[PDB]
Amino acid sequence: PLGSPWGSIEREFEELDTQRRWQPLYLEIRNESHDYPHRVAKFPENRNRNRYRDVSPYDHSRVKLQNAENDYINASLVDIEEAQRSYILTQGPLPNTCCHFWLMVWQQKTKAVVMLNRIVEKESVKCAQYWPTDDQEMLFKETGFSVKLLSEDVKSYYTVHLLQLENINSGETRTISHFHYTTWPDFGVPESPASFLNFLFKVRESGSLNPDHGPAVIHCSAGIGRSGTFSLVDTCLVLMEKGDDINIKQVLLNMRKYRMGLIQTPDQLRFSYMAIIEGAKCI
Ligand SMILES: O=C1CN(c2c(O)cc(-c3c[nH]c(C(=O)NC4CCCCCC4)n3)cc2F)S(=O)(=O)N1
């Protein structure tokens, strides 16, 4: 019907809820996702650059650190040509790879970092503290960068930090928008579709995903579950601009050719449908 662009997805959603097919649908996606080479991730010299041995970027889509003796970072370039959307999905940096993370942000001309995890979750560190929390500058001498906190905007479910990234050697500075969603549990879902959508709209409204910036850097802990959920919702909502009925299963499988394991639970998949539907209604 005319005023209901979400109609076909909403009909799918109710159909999958009624037949309780979220778990089998999720298994279909897992079964139909195919492996791709990830040899560089497994080189012995990169062992301490990977947070999890199980989560590796594919060789054909890894982001390379330029002008580096070792060019490896656990980060994947995920692009969806039909949507003209590109993202870098990456793990939460380790203490020894925070310098590589900022070098990547600089070289890729990234304007926004979307962080979907807490530093500490369930008595485990999921990500190093890679930006400063007070007025003291954080120095990454390995790669020649310093980060300063410029401002902090704390809301109920997320915080926005404005960071000043400076190339120490060149003297150039750039302001990075650090969008920190703080109420999304590991392997879980956000507090509500509404709270997630306000966060996503804030990222969109900022201008940080404009084509004249490099791709935004999206991360959680491993960079696949929450990062993949966030990416799928934004991408599908962009695809909906063209007015065709969209196949969410296929969009996700296509995204999974760029980075393994995007969306980690049947409930994250179900949340994805819900946020696309409620997001289309909001718009
Ligand atoms: O919703 C989400 C979920 N995420 C997420 C994540 O947190 C972790 C992992 C992962 C993959 N391998 C291992 C791993 O070997 N852990 C070992 C286990 C036994 C030894 C002691 C602790 C260390 N952990 C995969 C993910 F998808 S996410 O991608 O951050 N977003």
Side-chain angles (χ1 to χ4, degrees), residues 51-55 117 121 124 126 184-188 220-227 229 261 264-265 268:
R51 184 170 285 282
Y52 305 115
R53 304 143 47 133
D54 306 315
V55 185
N117 61 294
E121 304 176 320
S124 156
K126 309 297 281 196
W184 194 340
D186 195 29
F187 294 92
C220 45
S221 193
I224 59 184
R226 295 168 280 187
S227 300
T229 297
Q264 279 290 290
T265 72
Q268 284 184 347

Side-chain angles (χ1 to χ4, degrees), residues 223-252:
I224 59 184
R226 295 168 280 187
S227 300
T229 297
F230 173 95
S231 290
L232 178 70
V233 172
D234 177 58
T235 286
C236 285
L237 280 163
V238 169
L239 291 169
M240 285 183 75
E241 294 176 16
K242 289 203 306 196
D244 304 299
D245 282 354
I246 77 152
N247 185 334
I248 290 165
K249 176 178 171 176
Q250 196 50 235
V251 173
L252 178 55

Side-chain angles (χ1 to χ4, degrees), residues 29-125:
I29 291 159
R30 249 159 84 88
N31 176 49
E32 299 172 36
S33 315
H34 296 321
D35 205 41
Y36 294 81
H38 41 284
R39 313 240 199 288
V40 177
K42 296 296 198 172
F43 292 172
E45 61 264 32
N46 293 328
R47 243 211 90 70
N48 60 17
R49 300 184 172 215
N50 290 313
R51 184 170 285 282
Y52 305 115
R53 304 143 47 133
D54 306 315
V55 185
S56 312
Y58 297 139
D59 289 322
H60 72 265
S61 46
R62 65 185 193 94
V63 182
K64 295 178 185 194
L65 308 166
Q66 307 161 357
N67 315 320
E69 157 136 350
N70 190 340
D71 78 340
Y72 175 80
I73 182 175
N74 192 315
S76 309
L77 182 64
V78 174
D79 56 60
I80 306 100
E81 262 218 351
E82 320 70 338
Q84 321 255 66
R85 268 297 211 256
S86 212
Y87 322 88
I88 294 175
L89 268 65
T90 186
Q91 73 188 17
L94 297 151
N96 60 314
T97 78
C98 292
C99 55
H100 312 142
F101 178 93
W102 285 121
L103 173 62
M104 181 180 71
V105 164
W106 187 266
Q107 296 181 341
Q108 305 295 314
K109 306 189 154 41
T110 294
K111 199 78 194 149
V113 179
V114 176
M115 177 171 186
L116 304 168
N117 61 294
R118 289 192 202 141
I119 294 283
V120 171
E121 304 176 320
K122 293 213 190 134
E123 295 335 332
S124 156
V125 180

